[model samples]
Target: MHKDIFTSVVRVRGSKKYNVVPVKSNKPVEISKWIDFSNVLSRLYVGVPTKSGNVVCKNIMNTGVDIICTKNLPKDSLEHHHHHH
Candidate 1:
């Protein structure tokens, strides 16, 4: 049986601002794949269909790939937003 649990390694490469854009990289990548576990059963799952979620998820996945490929690439830092209450 193929279990729902799996592992994935995303390769990312970049240095300056242009690096964010998809182009060419001289780095070596041993593995690259996307695993979809969305088929798994989950009664507590709350689905949200919004453009915001799509944008955020895309950026995060890209960042993860970049971090794994580059050798001396600096880790990406998270920016915090303050709510005006």
Candidate 2:
């Protein structure tokens, strides 16, 4: 059996380096690696498509990384509509 999943690279906040993460399309990205990353920095980054959008990692932690509709980075936290409404 195979699970539906994909790989995405999210930029590390406050750093030029980017971190690669695995996302299960069924739910929000768990980012199991975040714990390790937490040991290295204080801020978190979650830019989808690996090009733009510096979304707050805290939000992404709950928001997931499966969204591919919005390409433009809003330059503000929570600017990317959660679509929860």
Candidate 3:
């Protein structure tokens, strides 16, 4: 089985588009908004995309990456403040 990986953003060559790449990292990546490639990336985290629903990954652990829906994440806790630039 593949080891756990973190979601990292990569810029397209000379273009504005970005790719959500996964890599082995010390900590898992976290975000409040929906990412671009979660549809495909969810496959890596979990085998079935249909059930996964491209959930947001907050704390990815060993073997499998844990994910949550955006709607539930916001209502769950208000501690983490969103800093929109």
Candidate 4:
């Protein structure tokens, strides 16, 4: 008989033996986020192109490179810090 490896195995975390938890529940999560690198980076560049042949260029002060919709966002995007620059 074959057993399912993902069948609710126990896991835990703590600070007994330097952050250790042996007995814990397996509460898996369904991650729901589509990824679009071009879209996200485009927004980062704030409008600069990943242009011709690059995801990031050696030029941030220049009109940068342009990536053409790789993996269809591989468009799914977030940012805005109550944090830092």
Best by TM-score: 2
All models, RMSD in angstroms: 15.6, 12.6, 13.3, 20.2
Residue 6 accuracy (lDDT) in model 1: 24
Model 2 segments beyond 4 Å from truth?
A: 1-3, 15-44, 47-85
lDDT of 2 by residue, 7-37 (tens): 3433433332334433223333335534433
Instruction: Give every collision pair in model 2.
Output: none
Global lDDT of each model? 0.25, 0.36, 0.34, 0.23
lDDT score for candidate 2 against the true structure: 0.36
TM-score of each: 0.18, 0.20, 0.18, 0.15
Instruction: Show how many residue pairs clash in every candidate, following the order shown.
Output: 3, 0, 0, 9
Q: What residue pairs are clashing in model 1? A: 11-65, 12-65, 12-66
Between candidates 1 and 2, name the one with more favorable lDDT. Answer: 2
How well is each residue in 1-85 modelled by candidate 4, as lDDT tens digits? 3321111111112222222111111222122101222223334422221222223323222323222211112111234555565
Worst 10 residues of 2 by lDDT: 15-24
Predicted structure 4: lDDT? 0.23
Which pairs clash inside model 4? 35-73, 35-74, 36-73, 36-75, 49-65, 50-65, 50-66, 51-65, 51-66
Stronger candidate by lDDT (1 vs 4): 1
Question: Regarding lDDT, does 2 or 3 come out ahead?
Answer: 2
Q: Which prediction has the highest lDDT against the true structure?
A: 2
lDDT of each residue in 1-85, candidate 3, tens digit only: 3333344432212221222322223434444212423433445432221221244443444325544321111212334578656
* Candidate 2 lDDT score at position 43: 46
Per-residue C-alpha lDDT of model 1 across residues 1-85, encoded as one tens digit per residue: 3322222222233432222211112222333322221121111122222221122122223433221222222234334686455
